[PDB]
Design a protein around this ligand. Sequence first.
Ligand SMILES: [Mg+2]
Ligand SMILES: [Mg+2]
Ligand SMILES: [Mg+2]
Ligand SMILES: [Mg+2]
Ligand SMILES: [Mg+2]
Ligand SMILES: [Mg+2]
Ligand SMILES: [Mg+2]
Ligand SMILES: [Mg+2]
Ligand SMILES: [Mg+2]
Ligand SMILES: [Mg+2]
Ligand SMILES: [Mg+2]
Ligand SMILES: [Mg+2]
Ligand SMILES: [Mg+2]
Ligand SMILES: [Mg+2]
Ligand SMILES: [Mg+2]
Ligand SMILES: [Mg+2]
Ligand SMILES: [Mg+2]
Ligand SMILES: [Mg+2]
Ligand SMILES: [Mg+2]
Ligand SMILES: [Mg+2]
Ligand SMILES: [Mg+2]
Ligand SMILES: [Mg+2]
Ligand SMILES: [Mg+2]
Ligand SMILES: [Mg+2]
Ligand SMILES: [Mg+2]
Ligand SMILES: [Mg+2]
Ligand SMILES: [Mg+2]
Ligand SMILES: [Mg+2]
Ligand SMILES: [Mg+2]
Ligand SMILES: [Mg+2]
Ligand SMILES: [Mg+2]
Ligand SMILES: [Mg+2]
Ligand SMILES: [Mg+2]
Ligand SMILES: [Mg+2]
Ligand SMILES: [Mg+2]
Ligand SMILES: [Mg+2]
Ligand SMILES: [Mg+2]
Ligand SMILES: [Mg+2]
Ligand SMILES: [Mg+2]
Ligand SMILES: [Mg+2]
Ligand SMILES: [Mg+2]
Ligand SMILES: [Mg+2]
Ligand SMILES: [Mg+2]
Ligand SMILES: [Mg+2]
Ligand SMILES: [Mg+2]
Ligand SMILES: [Mg+2]
Ligand SMILES: [Mg+2]
Ligand SMILES: [Mg+2]
Ligand SMILES: [Mg+2]
Ligand SMILES: [Mg+2]
Ligand SMILES: [Mg+2]
Ligand SMILES: [Mg+2]
Ligand SMILES: [Mg+2]
Ligand SMILES: [Mg+2]
Ligand SMILES: [Mg+2]
Ligand SMILES: [Mg+2]
Ligand SMILES: [Mg+2]
Ligand SMILES: [Mg+2]
Ligand SMILES: [Mg+2]
Ligand SMILES: [Mg+2]
Ligand SMILES: [Mg+2]
Ligand SMILES: [Mg+2]
Ligand SMILES: [Mg+2]
Ligand SMILES: [Mg+2]
Ligand SMILES: [Mg+2]
Ligand SMILES: [Mg+2]
Ligand SMILES: [Mg+2]
Ligand SMILES: [Mg+2]
Ligand SMILES: [Mg+2]
Ligand SMILES: [Mg+2]
Ligand SMILES: [Mg+2]
Ligand SMILES: [Mg+2]
Ligand SMILES: [Mg+2]
Ligand SMILES: [Mg+2]
Ligand SMILES: [Mg+2]
Ligand SMILES: [Mg+2]
Ligand SMILES: [Mg+2]
Ligand SMILES: [Mg+2]
Ligand SMILES: [Mg+2]
Ligand SMILES: [Zn+2]
Lengths: 138, 208, 99, 124, 71, 83
Amino acid sequence: MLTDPIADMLTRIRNATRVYKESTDVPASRFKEEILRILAREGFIKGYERVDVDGKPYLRVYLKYGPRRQGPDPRPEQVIHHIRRISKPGRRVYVGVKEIPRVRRGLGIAILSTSKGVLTDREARKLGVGGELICEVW
Amino acid sequence: GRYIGPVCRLCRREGVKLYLKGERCYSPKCAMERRPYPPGQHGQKRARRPSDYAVRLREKQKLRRIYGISERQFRNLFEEASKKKGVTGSVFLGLLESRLDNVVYRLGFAVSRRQARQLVRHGHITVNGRRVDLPSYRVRPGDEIAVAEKSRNLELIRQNLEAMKGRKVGPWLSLDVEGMKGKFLRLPDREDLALPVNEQLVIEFYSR
Amino acid sequence: PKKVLTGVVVSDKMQKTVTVLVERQFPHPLYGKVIKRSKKYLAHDPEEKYKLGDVVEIIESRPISKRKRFRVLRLVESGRMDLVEKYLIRRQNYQSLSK
Amino acid sequence: PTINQLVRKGREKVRKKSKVPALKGAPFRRGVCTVVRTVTPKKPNSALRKVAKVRLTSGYEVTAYIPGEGHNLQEHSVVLIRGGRVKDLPGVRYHIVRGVYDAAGVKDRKKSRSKYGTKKPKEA
Amino acid sequence: AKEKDTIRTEGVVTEALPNATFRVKLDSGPEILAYISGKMRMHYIRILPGDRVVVEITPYDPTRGRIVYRK
Amino acid sequence: MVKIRLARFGSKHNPHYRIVVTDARRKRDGKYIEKIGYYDPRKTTPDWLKVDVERARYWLSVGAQPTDTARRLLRQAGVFRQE
RNA sequence: AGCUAGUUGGUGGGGUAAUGGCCCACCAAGGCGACGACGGGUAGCCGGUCUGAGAGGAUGGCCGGCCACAGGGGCACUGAGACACGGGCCCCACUCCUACGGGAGGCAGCAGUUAGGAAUCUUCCGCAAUGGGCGCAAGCCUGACGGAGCGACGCCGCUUGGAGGAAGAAGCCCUUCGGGGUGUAAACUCCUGAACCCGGGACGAAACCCCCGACGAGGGGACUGACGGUACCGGGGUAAUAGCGCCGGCCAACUCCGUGCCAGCAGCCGCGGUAAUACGGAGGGCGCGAGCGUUACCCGGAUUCACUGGGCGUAAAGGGCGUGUAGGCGGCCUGGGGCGUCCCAUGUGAAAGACCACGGCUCAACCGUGGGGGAGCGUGGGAUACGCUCAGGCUAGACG
Ligand SMILES: [Mg+2]
Ligand SMILES: [Mg+2]
Ligand SMILES: [Mg+2]
Ligand SMILES: [Mg+2]
Ligand SMILES: [Mg+2]
Ligand SMILES: [Mg+2]
Ligand SMILES: [Mg+2]
Ligand SMILES: [Mg+2]
Ligand SMILES: [Mg+2]
Ligand SMILES: [Mg+2]
Ligand SMILES: [Mg+2]
Ligand SMILES: [Mg+2]
Ligand SMILES: [Mg+2]
Ligand SMILES: [Mg+2]
Ligand SMILES: [Mg+2]
Ligand SMILES: [Mg+2]
Ligand SMILES: [Mg+2]
Ligand SMILES: [Mg+2]
Ligand SMILES: [Mg+2]
Ligand SMILES: [Mg+2]
Ligand SMILES: [Mg+2]
Ligand SMILES: [Mg+2]
Ligand SMILES: [Mg+2]
Ligand SMILES: [Mg+2]
Ligand SMILES: [Mg+2]
Ligand SMILES: [Mg+2]
Ligand SMILES: [Mg+2]
Ligand SMILES: [Mg+2]
Ligand SMILES: [Mg+2]
Ligand SMILES: [Mg+2]
Ligand SMILES: [Mg+2]
Ligand SMILES: [Mg+2]
Ligand SMILES: [Mg+2]
Ligand SMILES: [Mg+2]
Ligand SMILES: [Mg+2]
Ligand SMILES: [Mg+2]
Ligand SMILES: [Mg+2]
Ligand SMILES: [Mg+2]
Ligand SMILES: [Mg+2]
Ligand SMILES: [Mg+2]
Ligand SMILES: [Mg+2]
Ligand SMILES: [Mg+2]
Ligand SMILES: [Mg+2]
Ligand SMILES: [Mg+2]
Ligand SMILES: [Mg+2]
Ligand SMILES: [Mg+2]
Ligand SMILES: [Mg+2]
Ligand SMILES: [Mg+2]
Ligand SMILES: [Mg+2]
Ligand SMILES: [Mg+2]
Ligand SMILES: [Mg+2]
Ligand SMILES: [Mg+2]
Ligand SMILES: [Mg+2]
Ligand SMILES: [Mg+2]
Ligand SMILES: [Mg+2]
Ligand SMILES: [Mg+2]
Ligand SMILES: [Mg+2]
Ligand SMILES: [Mg+2]
Ligand SMILES: [Mg+2]
Ligand SMILES: [Mg+2]
Ligand SMILES: [Mg+2]
Ligand SMILES: [Mg+2]
Ligand SMILES: [Mg+2]
Ligand SMILES: [Mg+2]
Ligand SMILES: [Mg+2]
Ligand SMILES: [Mg+2]
Ligand SMILES: [Mg+2]
Ligand SMILES: [Mg+2]
Ligand SMILES: [Mg+2]
Ligand SMILES: [Mg+2]
Ligand SMILES: [Mg+2]
Ligand SMILES: [Mg+2]
Ligand SMILES: [Mg+2]
Ligand SMILES: [Mg+2]
Ligand SMILES: [Mg+2]
Ligand SMILES: [Mg+2]
Ligand SMILES: [Mg+2]
Ligand SMILES: [Mg+2]
Ligand SMILES: [Mg+2]
Ligand SMILES: [Zn+2]
């Protein structure tokens, strides 16, 4: 059994983005989906769409990368330089509104699960709610 | 008790002209003239490249010695600026500039820093109609620093203000010469002070 | 407010009394993982109404005896011995790990 | 280690042992000499190091080093221990105070006089 | 200051103890521990266990001595 | 007996009293029930006595007793005036 | 690693202000423990304090709040209240009186003594102020308190002079013997005037009391100093304590002589075995200054017990393997509940401290006023993504 499907999803993408894969597939889940919405909304991925692979529903996640660079190692600068799961099973992380962090001095994001929905660190801070600090992304 | 002794021997150790002698730091006798090397046996010897700690240590000493203050007052004065809101650098300077004895010299009352220190110490300075004899008195903006009417007839006082006729005073300052008055208009800014010191070095000296 | 807790009966062997086990969820004060702590309460059953395994509510009460300050309020869930099974076996494991 | 583990067993603070059992944790401790000796050093150095077995008020018999060029500490003379170890002498974990009950300061000491317990001379 | 209570009494080596150590038996009285002087060791100079040697003794401990004269 | 008195919060040669409600059985510098004013005997500030009379009048209605000095300052603030 | 006999529970009784195995009887056979029972060690606890970027580590002196003890142990009486420091009864050890029969004691109250100890004060003034006991009051008691004394113990303010003054005295130190250094530093010119002398000389004080009014409101009137002739103001007035550590690097400051693995320095790495910037002195220099160095101890550096924020192929570290118990962890869909979680309200978070502001001692330390914060816990209300839960549905995991 897969333990932490979100962490697997983030790691699917973390592995996907380092070999510069066009797309990778992750098992479909409404929470996973509500996560990818923030990512496509925030411009970290090109986007996503549902897909059935051998009859099983997935999420085609299309990654994005910067410009091809100059001499040795012309491999483009990453768009998602960092992704880290935070509120893991067996060590759960919850923040209040005041306990919301400032990722990368504001240049990053922090995806929050709140009773009002899945939100970015800015989104919940202007909403004035807290919850499960799921992950840093930047 | 502050430092008492040879003054123009520390004009050379810092490498920059320090006018704590008052006069004779301007006439060709300062010992900064034709003698800019540090004192002692090994002054004229070639000096090695100072360490990073050496650079900040001297910058603090170059500033502390200018005002004539012991390190104990000097250090605690600095710690105040860090707690107070604003840039720690220029905040500290205005605090030194707000010392009563410094204001006496700044207003051109005294020849030197040490002279202003003794002028205040012997109670000759009036602040808003009240005599004050503490050189470490913090002058507020608007305070009236005047000369005691008892001492307005002292020939040393009329001596200095005779050379003050026509001399300009600090932008944050203003004095009445015939009445021997003077007012602390504002805390001086960084650009108000012509001090040959880099504040950031001294601040970095205290991060350790 | 008199404090009120919900637990399970784990001992019926006494007279006019029943032992009640109450779980508590709370995050760790440094490691922040949610941790499960339990506490046994001696509850008063004046009519021997409640039986082993019944899920009951308890209330802060005027002391009955040494080690008795809670009265049984009402039945929440009737007779779930799966919770009893967990309690007894943890007690029974202690028969090893002695010598 | 796992968070579950750290919950179950947790860290163990590191207990620091006192390098100076001058008991009661006292800054100093007075005692009487038992011997006054000269001990040879460890490998890198060679000299005759004046030390003294001392019987202390705490109830300890430990070695104490005698600083300075020359001393008057005798078999039964009373002294006060400072602490601090002589690097090149094994087992000598404490120093000796010059300027104390039966221990006099170094004569004609002119550079470091706070150390070695000597007064201030006069210049005519 | 270099106190001048040192002596230059003579003796005979007895034992060949480890690390430049001997049991030099003074002609005057008893034997001491008698480690070798540094000048001698820098100049090497092997000392057999039956040599006549000169000993430097500080009165602060007559139990110890220093072999100054090589043979 | 609940009593209304002064507690010395000043420094040496600079007294400063906190007019206070406390039980007489407590230390004069002990914990009190309610701070109901301050007194400066040296008169070194223009405002050297504040009372909040309508709060002081409450504690009297339940049985608090002032000291002869405490009664002096309350009357000075017109706690007792009834016109 | 197992503990428990009033031990756990019951009925009834005794008791107390009052619940209660608090005690008694009788009945039942229980209660606790790996979520750390029992046993051993240590320890008053907090408000806070110290440190630290912080999470945290440490501590609990003074001050404030609670607990406990009053030479040790036990006991009760009186009382609203004690099982009572300066009340009582008894056992024990001790000091003292003793007519040997028997008695009196209790500073962990203020000072003071002795012991130990590295070490910690005056056998002070005073009831003027605030507070407390009694009293109609007058007033009485108060080693609570307010002051003074001693101690650089801490903090803080202040002095040992300012200006003029030689391309530069004497002395010391170094030298390429030309000179360089101590250095405007001394002398000395001129000005000021710490101490000290003289007079004036406080606030802290206003009530209780008296009188008018009805012993009220209100008004009016009178006494009242320890500190102390102190603080402060006015006047006179003399150039008038500087010490301590360091100078091989970390770490800022260098030369000469002495000494030759010696004498010694040393926090660490290390110097010295004939030129030593490391040892000892001198000159010079660096650092602080009525202080300056050392040891002990705490924190930091230490990310070196790693929640923030470490690791286990070879550096310290995968259990020799399996099964499996407890525990921890949990795939996709839907729904109820809302325990965790989040939000708002509210009560609370004493004062002091800490933080911002203003103000009072000529500044400061200190002190006053006002402001704001704060986790946590109580309560009421709301949200349901996630975690939990109950119900159903699935087939990607697991099994067949
Ligand atoms: Mg601030
Ligand atoms: Mg600042
Ligand atoms: Mg201006
Ligand atoms: Mg820091
Ligand atoms: Mg039963
Ligand atoms: Mg009962
Ligand atoms: Mg068992
Ligand atoms: Mg262990
Ligand atoms: Mg009290
Ligand atoms: Mg009135
Ligand atoms: Mg019985
Ligand atoms: Mg009963
Ligand atoms: Mg439990
Ligand atoms: Mg349990
Ligand atoms: Mg104890
Ligand atoms: Mg840290
Ligand atoms: Mg801090
Ligand atoms: Mg403690
Ligand atoms: Mg503690
Ligand atoms: Mg005390
Ligand atoms: Mg007792
Ligand atoms: Mg007793
Ligand atoms: Mg009574
Ligand atoms: Mg008692
Ligand atoms: Mg008693
Ligand atoms: Mg009593
Ligand atoms: Mg007593
Ligand atoms: Mg007797
Ligand atoms: Mg003694
Ligand atoms: Mg005292
Ligand atoms: Mg008296
Ligand atoms: Mg009184
Ligand atoms: Mg009197
Ligand atoms: Mg009184
Ligand atoms: Mg009365
Ligand atoms: Mg009396
Ligand atoms: Mg006192
Ligand atoms: Mg001069
Ligand atoms: Mg003259
Ligand atoms: Mg004169
Ligand atoms: Mg005077
Ligand atoms: Mg008065
Ligand atoms: Mg008055
Ligand atoms: Mg009448
Ligand atoms: Mg009146
Ligand atoms: Mg008087
Ligand atoms: Mg002079
Ligand atoms: Mg340093
Ligand atoms: Mg250096
Ligand atoms: Mg020698
Ligand atoms: Mg040294
Ligand atoms: Mg050598
Ligand atoms: Mg030589
Ligand atoms: Mg030499
Ligand atoms: Mg040297
Ligand atoms: Mg050195
Ligand atoms: Mg030296
Ligand atoms: Mg010198
Ligand atoms: Mg000072
Ligand atoms: Mg000190
Ligand atoms: Mg630091
Ligand atoms: Mg440490
Ligand atoms: Mg740490
Ligand atoms: Mg370690
Ligand atoms: Mg970790
Ligand atoms: Mg490691
Ligand atoms: Mg290994
Ligand atoms: Mg293996
Ligand atoms: Mg799940
Ligand atoms: Mg579960
Ligand atoms: Mg809820
Ligand atoms: Mg709140
Ligand atoms: Mg507060
Ligand atoms: Mg002020
Ligand atoms: Mg609530
Ligand atoms: Mg709902
Ligand atoms: Mg739901
Ligand atoms: Mg199901
Ligand atoms: Mg099927
Ligand atoms: Zn000059």
